[PDB]
């Protein structure tokens, strides 16, 4: 189970991310071409490792790509609320002065509300209610 | 191209993360069951989406999981340095009060160094500079 062009796959990841600084590249564009890299590499490497998969259905291979990419997306969205729960658990009083949370909480709620909108997974603002 | 038990896949993710606070669970453990979640869900969802792949049989499907998991790990390692370079670029003065970076910088270098150690990818702390 070795990857097809693993050394070259690692470079493509760096470039996708490096293009945020080297070019003005939307966070959302990079997310998409990272999933393309990962999904593509999974199909490349499976063709290499399975004679039987190579034998099959270029239809199957485009579907594997589409599925793997969809999974990555849905995985990241699934991680957002538990993450907020973790963050909110760390900054909620007594861990922070409740007067201090009056200021801090809305800052983080706002920060994560940006992520909620970029990832199109809106989450209740009640997590931060206290 | 729908996922197999999408609502239930979202839950396995949360539990993997929620176990960071409860159980005081190892970071290496949580990251691993995350790649197993994703790798497993890719195989599950392709059984659902493609008729022939459901027909392909066990030899191929376990290889897919192995490959998918491997691709995820290598993707993370290739992304860590370019990611640090992005984070550092974003929070380095003037972007932040340089007195504020004095407090903030060492927190995130340590934060990222936790990840460096788990994945056996050390990166110079020089990236956080002045
Ligand atoms: Na929200
Ligand atoms: Na380091």
Q: Are A73 and B41 in contact (CB under 8 A)?
A: no
Distance from CA of B66 to the nearest CA of A (A): 7
Domain shared by B92 and B129, yes or no: yes
Please check whether residues B42 and B87 belong to one and the same domain. no
Residue A42 to residue B68, Cβ atoms within 8 A: yes
Segments forming the whole domain that contains residue A84: 76-130
Distance (Å, whole) CA B73 – CA A120: 26
The answer on B49 and B2 residing in a single domain is yes
CA dihedral A88, A89, A90, A96 (to 10 degrees): 80
Q: Give the DSSP letter of residue B2.
A: P
Q: Does B64 reside within a domain?
A: no
Evaluate whether residue B103 is within a structural domain: yes
Radius of gyration of chain A (CA): 20
Is the residue at B13 inside a domain?
yes
> What is the tally of structural domains in chain B?
2
Among residues B116, B96, B123, the alpha carbon closest in space to that of B28 is found at B116
Ligand 2 center–CA A59 separation, angstroms: 43
Resolution for this experimental structure (Å) = 3.0
For residues B83 and B128, membership in a common domain is answered with: yes
Q: Which residues of B touch A41 (CB under 8 A)?
A: 71, 75
Interface touch A74/B17, C-beta < 8 Å: no
Kindly list the protein residues that place their beta carbon closer than 5 angstroms to ligand 2, a single-atom ion. B 113, 116, 123, 125
Output the six-digit token pair for A1: 């189970």
Altogether, the residues listed in chain A come to a count of 130
**Domain check: are A89 and A39 in the same one?**
no
Interface of A with B in 13-72 (CB under 8 A): 13-14, 17-18, 20-21, 34, 37-38, 41-42, 45-46, 49-50, 52-53, 56-57, 59-60, 63-64, 66-68, 70-72
The answer as to whether A18 is a domain residue is yes
- A110: contact with B, CB 8 A cutoff: no
**Is B115 contained in some domain?**
yes
* Nearest ligand, measured from the Cα of A117: 1
Question: Does A86 touch chain B if contact means CB atoms closer than 8 Å?
Answer: yes
Report the interhelical angle of A27-49 vs B58-91 (nearest 10°). 150
Neighbours of A109 (CB within 10 A): 19
With CA atoms as reference, the chain B residue closest to A62 would be B50
**Among A20, A36, A42, A72, the residue to mutate for chain B (most B Cβ within 10 A):** A42
* Cα(B39)–Cα(B33) distance, integer angstroms: 10
* Residue A63 within any structural domain of the chain: no
Query: Based on the domain organization, do B52 and B85 belong to the same domain?
Result: no
B8 and B46 in a single domain? The answer is: yes
Report the phi/psi class of residue B110: left, alpha or beta, with left for phi > 0 and alpha for psi in -120 to 50: alpha
Residue B43 included in any domain: yes
| Cβ contact B37:A103 at 8 Å | no
Instruction: Evaluate whether residue A123 is within a structural domain.
Output: yes
Q: What would the DSSP string read from start to end of B62-111?
A: HHHHHHHHHHHHHHHHHHHHHHHHHHHHHHSTTSS-HHHHHHHHHHHHHH
Asked if A2 and A52 sit in the same domain, the reply is yes
């Amino acid at each position: 189970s070795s990857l097809e062009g693993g050394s070259e796959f690692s470079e493509r990841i760096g470039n996708s991310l490096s293009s945020f600084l080297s070019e003005s590249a939307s966070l959302e564009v990079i997310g998409n071409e990272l999933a393309d890299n990962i999904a593509n590499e999974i199909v490349s490497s499976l063709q290499k490792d399975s004679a039987s998969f190579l034998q099959s259905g270029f239809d199957v291979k485009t579907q594997l790509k589409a599925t793997a990419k969809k999974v990555l997306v849905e995985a990241l969205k699934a991680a957002l609320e538990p993450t907020e729960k973790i963050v909110a658990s760390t900054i909620k009083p007594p861990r922070v002065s409740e007067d201090a949370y009056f200021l801090l909480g809305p800052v983080v709620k706002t920060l994560f509300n940006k992520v909620e909108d970029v990832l199109h997974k809106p989450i209740p603002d009640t997590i931060w209610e206290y």
